[PDB]
Design a protein around this ligand. Structure first.
Ligand code: NA
Length: 96
């Protein structure tokens, strides 16, 4: 049996084929088991966004999730990714 806590990375990318678009990304990497909850916050409040995820796994059965959504960020607005996993006693919130 094995359990591994996720690493969580929050960053923005513009797709090069549509430079004007901007995506908020939450890369949740190396975790086990695969059971997980991930959502978006803004200024602390959950926000309704259109959800996209890519889920894959490696040979040692770690899971990797890219959770991403388009956004138009402000300087004053605080975006964060919130992750709940069996290894985390509290939800982990990672600011953009
Ligand atoms: Na937990």
């Amino acid at each position: 049996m094995i359990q591994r806590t996720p690493k969580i990375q929050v960053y923005s990318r513009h797709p090069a084929e549509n430079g004007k678009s901007n995506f908020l990304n939450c890369y949740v990497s190396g975790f086990h088991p695969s059971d997980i909850e991930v959502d978006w916050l803004k200024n602390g409040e959950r926000i309704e966004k259109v959800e996209h995820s890519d889920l894959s796994f490696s040979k040692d059965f770690s899971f990797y999730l890219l959770y991403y959504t388009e956004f138009t960020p402000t300087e004053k607005d605080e975006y964060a990714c919130r992750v709940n996993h069996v290894t985390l006693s509290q939800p982990k919130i990672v600011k953009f």
